């Protein structure tokens, strides 16, 4: 039955597994400080909203091709250094949360500090809450992080903000949680009846969205890549991924998003006609692009032939443009989609 510290007081906070504020980012004139159960049911069907808003991040390729909504839960999967962090910091910096909540399941607290030391600069820091756990804390401790993060985010959504929620890294989460299944005597082969340690990752999952009767949760879930079970099945839960590729990464695109193994399953419900229609005639032009590479490859091109392979040669440029992106920078929609109109005509 343990509880967490939940409220605005938290606000530019760094809470412990334990509940326990540590340290600062920023400071607030807010201290209110309640108390709430870590562990609550999700939502009643009735009780959620449909997603049909979107949930801009700022970044082009998302918001045009991969557009999010608010209550949505998306995952992240990524190799080691395909700049999931970075791309949490980007995602947290050019969106347009109300607040953000940070729940950091790391192994080292170098990792911690240095997400730390980016809030400490960061322009949403009087707006983030963030939640730690490291190698040195047992896997109990680090499930907790995750509940806590996950509670801290609910409470907001309760007084009607829109929250951004952020779990890095899910894998490091169902590690713990399946050392904490052994101690209660469970394995992921043999578990446990009516109740599994291993259902605390579907329960943990359900629980963003948007309420009817209150704000809404946008959850943004980390998932390590080496393709493993686990990731084949929170790609199943989820309402959509976002995928890394560390081929793009080396090739020094950034970010490395894969919008061809990339997709936002409420995409349809949150953007209009006209947008439907540039992005589906952008995601063409990428697929012939990826073919010419091929052909490129092969040795099979030459210029002068084939009017229409020249035509897509002469695009590739143009299109590394659109989905490059410095870290630091943030788009609004109307530039976006100015942007990836030029792009198509």
């Given at each position: 039955?343990?509880h967490?510290q939940?409220?605005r007081?938290?606000?530019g906070?760094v809470?412990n597994p334990?509940g326990?504020?540590?340290?600062?980012?920023?400071?607030?004139d807010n201290?209110?400080i309640?108390y709430?159960?870590?562990d609550?049911?999700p939502?009643?069907?009735?009780?959620?909203a449909?997603?049909?808003?979107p949930f801009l991040?700022?970044?082009?390729?998302?918001?045009?091709?991969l557009t999010?909504g608010?209550?949505?839960?998306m995952?992240?999967?990524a190799?080691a250094?395909?700049?999931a962090t970075?791309?949490?910091n980007?995602?947290?910096?050019?969106s347009?949360a109300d607040?953000?909540?940070?729940?950091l399941?790391?192994?080292?607290?170098?990792?911690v500090?240095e997400?730390?030391?980016?809030?400490?600069?960061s322009?949403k820091?009087?707006?983030?809450?963030?939640?730690?756990?490291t190698?040195?804390?047992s896997?109990?401790?680090?499930?907790?992080?995750?509940y806590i993060?996950?509670?801290?985010?609910?409470?907001?959504?309760?007084?009607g903000?829109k929250?951004?929620l952020?779990?890095?890294?899910?894998t490091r989460y169902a590690?713990?949680?399946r050392?904490?299944?052994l101690?209660?005597g469970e394995?992921?082969?043999?578990?446990?009846y009516?109740?599994?340690?291993?259902?605390?990752?579907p329960?943990?999952?359900?629980r963003?969205?948007?309420?009817?009767?209150?704000?809404?949760?946008?959850?943004?879930?980390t998932v390590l890549?080496?393709a493993?079970p686990?990731?084949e099945e929170?790609?199943?839960?989820?309402d959509?991924h976002?995928y890394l590729?560390?081929?793009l990464?080396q090739?020094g695109?950034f970010?490395?998003i894969?919008?061809?193994?990339?997709?936002?399953?409420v995409?349809?419900?949150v953007?209009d006609?006209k947008?439907?229609?540039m992005?589906?005639a952008?995601r063409?032009?990428?697929?012939?692009?990826?073919?010419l590479?091929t052909i490129?490859?092969?040795?099979?091109y030459?210029?002068?032939?084939?009017?229409?392979?020249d035509?897509?040669?002469?695009k590739?440029?143009?299109?590394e443009s659109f989905?490059?992106q410095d870290?630091?920078?943030?788009f609004?929609?109307?530039?976006?989609m100015?942007?990836?109109?030029?792009?198509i005509?």
């Amino acid at each position: 039955f343990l509880h967490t510290q939940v409220g605005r007081g938290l606000l530019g906070a760094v809470v412990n597994p334990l509940g326990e504020v540590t340290d600062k980012f920023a400071v607030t004139d807010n201290s209110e400080i309640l108390y709430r159960p870590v562990d609550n049911a999700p939502p009643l069907y009735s009780e959620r909203a449909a997603i049909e808003k979107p949930f801009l991040t700022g970044i082009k390729v998302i918001d045009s091709l991969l557009t999010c909504g608010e209550g949505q839960r998306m995952g992240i999967f990524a190799s080691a250094g395909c700049g999931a962090t970075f791309l949490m910091n980007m995602l947290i910096e050019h969106s347009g949360a109300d607040i953000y909540v940070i729940g950091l399941i790391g192994e080292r607290g170098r990792e911690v500090t240095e997400t730390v030391d980016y809030l400490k600069n960061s322009e949403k820091k009087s707006r983030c809450v963030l939640v730690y756990a490291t190698s040195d804390y047992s896997s109990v401790d680090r499930c907790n992080a995750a509940y806590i993060a996950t509670a801290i985010a609910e409470f907001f959504r309760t007084e009607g903000h829109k929250v951004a929620l952020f779990i890095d890294s899910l894998t490091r989460y169902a590690r713990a949680l399946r050392d904490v299944a052994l101690a209660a005597g469970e394995s992921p082969a043999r578990r446990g009846y009516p109740v599994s340690v291993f259902d605390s990752l579907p329960r943990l999952l359900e629980r963003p969205g948007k309420l009817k009767a209150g704000g809404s949760i946008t959850a943004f879930y980390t998932v390590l890549l080496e393709a493993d079970p686990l990731a084949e099945e929170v790609r199943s839960i989820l309402d959509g991924h976002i995928y890394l590729s560390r081929n793009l990464a080396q090739k020094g695109q950034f970010p490395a998003i894969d919008s061809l193994k990339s997709i936002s399953r409420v995409f349809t419900q949150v953007v209009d006609e006209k947008h439907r229609i540039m992005a589906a005639a952008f995601r063409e032009l990428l697929s012939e692009i990826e073919e010419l590479r091929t052909i490129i490859d092969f040795g099979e091109y030459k210029p002068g032939e084939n009017a229409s392979q020249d035509k897509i040669y002469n695009k590739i440029s143009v299109v590394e443009s659109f989905l490059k992106q410095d870290y630091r920078l943030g788009f609004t929609y109307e530039q976006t989609m100015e942007l990836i109109g030029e792009t198509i005509r």
